[PDB]
Enzyme design. Structure first.
Site, PDB file in Angstrom:
ATOM      1  N   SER A 278     -10.995  -0.329  -0.478  1.00 25.81           N
ATOM      2  CA  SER A 278      -9.982  -0.779   0.170  1.00 25.81           C
ATOM      3  C   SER A 278     -10.037  -0.746   1.649  1.00 25.81           C
ATOM      4  O   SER A 278      -8.859  -0.688   2.252  1.00 25.81           O
ATOM      5  CB  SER A 278      -8.940  -0.245  -0.533  1.00 25.81           C
ATOM      6  OG  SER A 278      -9.185   1.260  -0.358  1.00 25.81           O
TER       7      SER A 278
ATOM      8  N   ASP B 245       0.870  -1.243   0.129  1.00 21.59           N
ATOM      9  CA  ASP B 245       0.067  -0.169   0.028  1.00 21.59           C
ATOM     10  C   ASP B 245       0.925   1.210   0.132  1.00 21.59           C
ATOM     11  O   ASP B 245       2.037   1.335  -0.382  1.00 21.59           O
ATOM     12  CB  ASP B 245      -1.017  -0.096   1.065  1.00 21.59           C
ATOM     13  CG  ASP B 245      -2.251   0.389   0.824  1.00 21.59           C
ATOM     14  OD1 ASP B 245      -2.471   1.777   0.686  1.00 21.59           O
ATOM     15  OD2 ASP B 245      -3.166  -0.065   0.741  1.00 21.59           O
TER      16      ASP B 245
ATOM     17  N   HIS C 193      -3.210   6.528   3.076  1.00 19.68           N
ATOM     18  CA  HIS C 193      -3.926   5.448   2.928  1.00 19.68           C
ATOM     19  C   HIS C 193      -3.545   4.139   3.737  1.00 19.68           C
ATOM     20  O   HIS C 193      -4.419   3.364   4.275  1.00 19.68           O
ATOM     21  CB  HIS C 193      -4.215   5.374   1.350  1.00 19.68           C
ATOM     22  CG  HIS C 193      -5.143   4.272   1.180  1.00 19.68           C
ATOM     23  ND1 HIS C 193      -4.740   2.837   0.885  1.00 19.68           N
ATOM     24  CD2 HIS C 193      -6.477   4.170   0.612  1.00 19.68           C
ATOM     25  CE1 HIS C 193      -5.447   2.115   0.471  1.00 19.68           C
ATOM     26  NE2 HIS C 193      -6.611   2.984   0.393  1.00 19.68           N
TER      27      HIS C 193
END
Ligand code: CA
Ligand code: CA
Ligand code: CA
Ligand code: CA
Ligand code: CA
Ligand code: CA
Ligand code: CA
Ligand code: CA
Ligand code: CA
Ligand code: CA
Ligand code: CL
Ligand code: MG
Length: 1394
Positions: free
Chosen positions: A436, A35, A102
């Site tokens: 996600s 990620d 994120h």
């Protein structure tokens, strides 16, 4: 301690605690999170008791790394036990934004383990608080070509270092299950076999058309599930919205006692544009407000104008700005728009042209505040609060849906992804939404179901384990019911259901259809659905279950003809009981006759519909324990054969219908080429009578023409029909036609063919586009995603497969393609098309001297296009000349058009000429056909000098004002000369006009650069003027063909030694494809007067690579700057034959200039040249108005390739510095190439180089100090090309070699599709394979939707369909195929018995 309490807003729902309380918290497992970022200092980033971890120390790690070859990336602490930045090749793994990272948030969700309180007072945990985290920072730039290789290293590293699960956010809309990118799929298979759960977010595009309007009911293939998670092995995760939501709220304490309004506390949504409430009104300060009815002015004038935050309901007509602005006008301070629809989830406005009042949408019609009747006070919380959510327990709007591109049911399961509160950087938390977020919920839960399976089934092999972890999670999921509609949520949207962790580590049951998977894709459905469901029991006690199957389909708003993306329930068909042996399985047979529903549903979904749903199992005694269930979906119809493209805007308009994305604003039948439709497009260019037109007009939709207002209109002929007609004549007005599509499904194999229209069955192609195309449905999920795609590669231009000219006539232009489902039928779409190259008829007219009436004969065309418009104009003089020149000073562009002014056409067909306004004989009459042929008579051309009289008949002839430009000749050939000629032009440096080109002799340096730049683009032959060249042919042969027996391009019939164009080779095959760099034999053959046969042979070289300018030297001499370029070398095909230093002088304020020559206007850079001095320097002088960035160095090679650089750019290199440049070396034309790749340069110790400086505005060229280095190719488009040379190259800069060129040699990849179609289903036990040239077997498997068919996508090559076949059986038919690039190859094979 006495620790803060845990937020179970999500755990209560997914039932985590049922696993935690059985000792399953993730201890001694590891999640690999691939990620964006991570802060491993975060208080959440914690393990309890390292003693029980998978990796027990910083040294257990360096012990795992060296163990498997990983020379990079550090262990960080007991929690984050591995981390590497795979983009930089760094250990910088933390993002720097507004704490909003994120990957941070994702990790919080799967394994957060804090002891401290976030701002609610609670502490937050992930599904697996005691699991260890490896983080791989991996993320994509367009600048890379393909980041895929990076993801595979992270996956392979994760496996090697010992992860139990991997969490991918990665996605490409409209994934296929069987044909994703194979390097990445195989990497995933490899983790599955290592017992790794691969968990992937399903995507956030929602469904076809999602940013536009819901999908038409004739278009059931609306699914968009992600490209890796759509694969059979990964676990593919849809998102549901959290029931609780942590946000700053708004409170009116005057509404404290309304407990259905969270005790006076609202959720407000400001527009994503503005967001001005905090900074303009300020938290925690209290303000007045006043109800305004009616956002007019009337509504008690402006009572809410003193300081009141103005409170108004939405007027669905007035716009958000007609509202905020009208309030700010009356004194607003800021306004609240509370929803007009009751109970609705806060519409998102965005809407911000003219805001500046600080605005937000108040929750719903609910929260109409009417205290003391309009007046009240309110304040904005500064801290976040828990609030019931306005959209909880609803599927998140954007979770991907639908089937995979090739027909399979995905996603697989749902988890909370909406408004999830998790960890940000620097001990912050925040909430954030998307699929996600849901994915790490399931990553965590498969950590735990793995822990379980390991304790409770220790005799389960690595290979089988991740597939069972998945099957439990699914089978134990809670089937979700849409709360707005009280119907089961579609399994295309929710998968196998909502996550139930307890259920999964408790029930010891899971379910499986025939294909051994927790869901069931049936393919096509026919009046009777039969299938086999199988329950499996991991308990050693036993279970007896009662079951029943609910059958659903899609609801259609019958006012709109559009799916609502909600399901309607058909019939809960009833099942039975069965008992499931301990450590065994039982299989039941579901059967439903759906014959009943066919007529009602086929009526509202004429191309078929989904029949889906669940099979539910409960304990027969107590229907609340042992709750497990399986989803299924089929297609009533033929899913493989759904239309791939929307119908042509022509056909749709002709039947009163419209495109899905077609903007019908404007004047009736406007089809402006920028709108979105299936159609054809073409190029237009204007016809001028006073000067040569120097530029075209751009693409426009074919069949449309500008009306008086300049809108392009689909005009009709006398019979009320548009006309698709092209005039391939060289004048650049409608010379070609190319397909533009609005694609409904993913397409492959797309090409264009032209047949003569009397070849009704399309069996004899006269022309086929050289390439074939493939691509994505135009799903338009947001503004970045095209609503239509134009395929200019399908351009047809009236030339055939040979290059011959196809005669004027009536043809069919057929665009064919295939969906992405094996066995589907080839779809054609046909455009009737005129080839007409003949201008309309200019006969004569009747001018009457005192009625002033000019009337021409009725309109007649030559050819089938037909006359479209009649015209008269004169040239209004202006600035003394009949045209106006227009210089776009900002784009550096010049254009020229007549000052045409037009005489109105009286309804009877005639024109009243204004001879006050110019002479008769300075009027032009004009007739246009639908193909773009334009006839113009200057009527003066045939005037009698007996002017005034009585009515006279006037002869009109065309003036050839519309003709194809022709190249300046000037040349006289001696017998000395070769015979060869080519063209010559300079390259503009500032202006973007087409520089002037003229013909030149070619008696040496036989090298061309077919790049359409004016300079050495072709090789033509010119004969001595009085010599005769009878029967003259040019053929071009490849170097292999030494017998000169099979040409690769030939002159068309009728070529002549003095028509140059007929003889000109532009490095192109007979089909018009650019040839590859190399040598060719150009052979000129003719017979003379006497009949002796002559042949002239020449070796032409094709090469269009631009030359590389190196940085040269600078020195000051007598106080003036001197430039000395490095010595150019002259070694052929690339050696430099021209060398210039110049500068551009400003005149009339600019650096280019227009010159009105005798024919027409021409554009040039204001070039002034600098003599080369005898020491090879050029003197770069003082010169008022001129800076070093106005001086250029320019070079030309023997091929006519040109490069240039400003001297400012060459001087940016220090005198002690060197330059290295990296590039790819592909054996194709420059327009056929990758330019996209990234690379790493390391210094002599292996340290990545820092503080980059670039040479000549290229990010593939660096300025570095002298030294030893290495470069490593990092990424490139691996679906397009294969690396052939070394991936790591060493090089040494130094004052002698102060410019290095490093190239990665590559080859290019080409795929094809193969489908073997059989007579009748093959008998059981037969195997189908493709046998390769080297003798190996590529297994094929049956198509789901077309079971007589087996197909695969392969590397371009030669293959044979071999079939294994039991008993007495045989295959007949052609089994061998030589595939072509991007083609789809069908072999019909016949099965025979006796
Ligand atoms: Ca946390
Ligand atoms: Ca035109
Ligand atoms: Ca034309
Ligand atoms: Ca077939
Ligand atoms: Ca015509
Ligand atoms: Ca006109
Ligand atoms: Ca050229
Ligand atoms: Ca660095
Ligand atoms: Ca079929
Ligand atoms: Ca090829
Ligand atoms: Cl919308
Ligand atoms: Mg919307």
């Amino acid at each position: 301690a006495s620790l803060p309490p845990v937020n179970t807003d999500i755990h209560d729902w997914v039932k985590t605690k049922g696993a935690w309380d059985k000792g399953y918290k993730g201890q001694g497992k590891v999640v690999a999170v691939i990620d964006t970022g991570i802060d491993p200092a975060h208080q959440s980033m914690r393990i309890s008791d390292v003693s029980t971890a998978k990796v027990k120390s910083k040294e257990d790690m360096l012990a795992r790394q060296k163990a498997a070859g990983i020379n990079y990336g550090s262990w960080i602490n007991d929690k984050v036990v591995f981390a590497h930045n795979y983009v930089e090749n760094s250990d910088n793994i933390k993002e720097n934004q507004k704490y909003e990272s994120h990957g941070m948030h994702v990790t919080g969700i799967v394994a957060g383990n804090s002891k401290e309180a976030a701002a609610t007072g609670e502490r937050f945990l992930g599904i697996a608080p005691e699991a260890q985290v490896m983080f791989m920072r991996v993320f994509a730039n367009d600048v890379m070509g393909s980041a895929e290789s990076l993801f595979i290293k992270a996956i392979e590293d994760a496996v090697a270092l010992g992860a139990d699960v991997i969490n991918l956010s990665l996605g490409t809309a409209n994934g296929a299950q069987l044909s994703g990118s194979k390097p990445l799929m195989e990497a995933i298979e490899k983790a599955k076999k290592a017992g790794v759960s691969v968990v992937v977010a399903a995507g956030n595009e929602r469904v076809y058309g999602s940013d536009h309007d819901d999908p038409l009911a004739t278009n059931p293939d609306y699914g968009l599930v992600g490209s890796p998670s759509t694969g059979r092995t990964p676990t593919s995760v849809a998102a549901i919205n959290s029931k609780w939501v942590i946000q700053r709220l708004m409170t009116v304490e005057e509404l404290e006692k309304r407990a259905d309004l969270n005790h006076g506390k609202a959720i407000y949504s400001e527009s994503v544009d503005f967001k001005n409430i905090k900074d303009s009104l300020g938290y925690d300060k209290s303000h007045q407000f006043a109800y305004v009815k009616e956002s007019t002015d009337a509504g008690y004038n402006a009572q809410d104008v003193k300081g009141k935050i103005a409170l108004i309901e939405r007027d669905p007509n007035k716009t958000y700005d007609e509202m905020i602005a009208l309030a700010k006008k009356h004194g607003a301070l800021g306004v609240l728009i509370f929803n007009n629809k009751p109970g609705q989830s806060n519409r998102s406005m965005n809407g911000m042209g003219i805001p500046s009042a600080f605005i937000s949408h108040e929750f719903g019609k609910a929260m109409s505040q009417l205290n003391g009747n309009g007046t009240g006070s309110l304040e904005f919380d500064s801290v976040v609060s828990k609030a019931p959510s306005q959209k909880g327990n609803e599927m998140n709007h954007f979770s991907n849906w639908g089937l995979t591109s090739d027909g399979y049911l995905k996603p697989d399961i749902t988890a909370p992804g909406g408004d999830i509160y998790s960890t940000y950087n620097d001990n912050h938390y925040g909430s954030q939404t998307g699929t996600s977020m849901a994915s790490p919920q399931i990553a965590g839960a498969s950590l735990l179901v793995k822990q379980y399976l390991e304790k409770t089934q220790p005799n389960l092999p690595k290979e089988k384990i991740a597939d069972i972890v998945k099957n439990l999670l699914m089978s134990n999921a809670q089937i979700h019911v849409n709360p707005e509609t009280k119907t089961t949520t579609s399994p295309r949207q929710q998968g196998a259901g909502l996550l139930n962790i307890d259920g999964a580590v408790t029930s010891g049951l899971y379910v499986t259809g025939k294909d051994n998977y927790g869901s069931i894709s049936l393919g096509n459905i026919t009046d009777t659905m039969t299938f086999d469901v199988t329950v499996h029991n991991l308990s050693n006690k036993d279970k007896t279950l009662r079951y029943d199957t609910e059958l659903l389909t899609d609801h259609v708003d019958p006012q709109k003809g559009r799916f609502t993306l909600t399901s309607r329930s058909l019939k809960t068909y009833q099942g039975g009981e069965v008992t499931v042996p301990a450590n065994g399985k039982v299989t039941v047979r579901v059967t439903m006759d759906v014959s009943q529903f066919t007529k009602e549903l086929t009526k509202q979904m004429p191309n078929g519909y989904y029949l889906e749903g669940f099979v539910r199992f409960r304990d027969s005694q107590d229907d609340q324990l042992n709750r497990v269930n399986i989803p299924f979906v089929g297609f009533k119809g033929q899913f493989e054969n759904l239309a791939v493209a929307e119908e042509s805007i022509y056909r749709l308009k002709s039947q009163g219908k419209t495109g899905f994305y077609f903007d019908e604003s404007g004047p009736k039948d406007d089809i402006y080429v920028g709108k979105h439709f299936t159609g054809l497009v073409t190029l237009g260019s204007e016809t001028n009578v006073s000067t040569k037109t120097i530029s075209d007009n751009g693409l426009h939709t074919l069949g449309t023409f500008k009306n008086a207002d300049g809108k392009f209109i689909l005009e009709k002929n006398a019979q009320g029909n548009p006309v698709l007609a092209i005039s391939p004549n060289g004048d650049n007005n409608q010379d070609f036609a190319a397909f533009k599509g609005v694609f409904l499904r993913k397409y492959q194999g797309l090409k264009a063919s032209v047949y003569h229209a009397s070849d009704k069955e399309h069996k004899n192609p006269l022309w086929v586009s050289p390439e074939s195309f493939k691509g994505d449905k135009n799903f338009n999920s947001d503004i970045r995603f095209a609503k239509s795609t134009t395929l200019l590669g399908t351009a047809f231009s009236g030339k055939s497969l040979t290059g011959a000219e196809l005669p004027d006539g009536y043809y069919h232009y057929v665009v064919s393609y295939y969906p992405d489902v094996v066995g589907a039928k080839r779809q054609e779409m046909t455009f009737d098309m005129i080839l007409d190259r003949q201008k309309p008829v200019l006969s004569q007219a009747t001018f009457d001297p005192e009625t002033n009436r000019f009337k021409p004969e009725p309109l007649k065309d030559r050819g089938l296009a037909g006359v479209r418009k009649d015209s008269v104009f004169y040239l209004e003089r202006k600035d003394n000349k009949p045209y106006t020149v227009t210089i776009n000073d900002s784009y550096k562009y010049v254009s020229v058009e007549d000052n045409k002014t037009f005489v109105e056409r009286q309804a009877d067909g005639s024109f009243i000429l204004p001879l006050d306004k110019a002479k008769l004989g300075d009027f032009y009459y004009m007739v246009e056909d639908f193909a773009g042929n334009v006839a113009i008579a200057k009527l003066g051309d045939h005037l009698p000098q007996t002017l005034g009289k009585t009515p006279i008949k006037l002869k009109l002839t065309d003036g050839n004002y519309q003709t194809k430009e022709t190249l300046k000749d000037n040349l006289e050939m001696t017998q000395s000369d070769t015979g060869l000629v080519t063209n010559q032009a300079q390259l503009a440096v500032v202006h973007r006009n087409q520089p002037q080109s003229q013909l030149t002799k070619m008696n040496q340096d036989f090298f061309i650069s077919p790049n359409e730049d004016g300079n050495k683009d072709f090789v033509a032959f010119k004969g001595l003027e009085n010599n005769v060249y009878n029967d003259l042919t040019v053929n071009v042969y490849a170097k292999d063909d030494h017998q000169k027996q099979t040409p690769i391009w030939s002159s068309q019939a009728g070529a002549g030694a003095s028509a140059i164009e007929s003889t000109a080779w532009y490095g192109i095959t007979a089909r018009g494809s650019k040839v590859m760099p190399g040598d060719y034999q150009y052979v000129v053959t003719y017979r003379d007067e006497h009949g002796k046969e002559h042949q002239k042979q020449y070796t032409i070289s094709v090469n269009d690579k631009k030359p590389m300018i190196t940085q040269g030297r600078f020195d000051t001499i007598n106080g003036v700057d001197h430039f000395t370029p490095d010595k150019t070398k002259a070694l052929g095909s690339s050696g430099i034959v021209r060398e210039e230093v110049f500068y551009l002088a400003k005149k009339n304020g600019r650096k280019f200039d227009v010159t009105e020559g005798k024919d027409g206007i021409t554009v040039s850079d204001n070039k002034v040249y600098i003599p080369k001095n005898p020491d090879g320097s050029y003197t770069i002088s003082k010169r008022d108005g001129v800076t070093l960035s106005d001086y250029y160095y320019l070079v030309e090679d023997r091929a006519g390739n040109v490069s240039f650089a400003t001297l400012r750019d060459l001087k940016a290199v220090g005198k002690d510095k060197a330059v290295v440049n990296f590039g790819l070396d592909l054996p194709v034309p420059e327009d056929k190439q990758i330019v996209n790749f990234t690379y790493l340069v390391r210094d002599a110790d292996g340290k990545p180089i820092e503080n980059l400086e670039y040479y000549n505005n290229s990010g593939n060229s660096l300025i570095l100090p002298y030294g030893k280095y290495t470069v490593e190719l990092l990424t490139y488009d691996t679906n397009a090309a294969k690396l052939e040379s070394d991936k790591i190259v060493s090089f040494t800069l130094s004052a002698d070699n102060n410019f290095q060129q490093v190239t990665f040699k590559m080859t290019m990849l080409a795929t094809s599709q193969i489908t073997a179609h059989f007579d009748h289903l093959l008998p059981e036990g037969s195997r189908v394979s493709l046998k390769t040239a080297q003798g190996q077997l590529i297994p094929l498997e049956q198509s789901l939707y077309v079971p007589k068919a087996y197909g695969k996508t392969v590397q371009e090559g030669t293959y044979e369909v071999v079939v294994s076949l039991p008993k007495g059986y045989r295959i007949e038919g052609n089994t061998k195929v030589n595939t072509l690039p991007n083609e789809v190859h069908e072999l019909s094979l016949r099965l025979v018995k006796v």
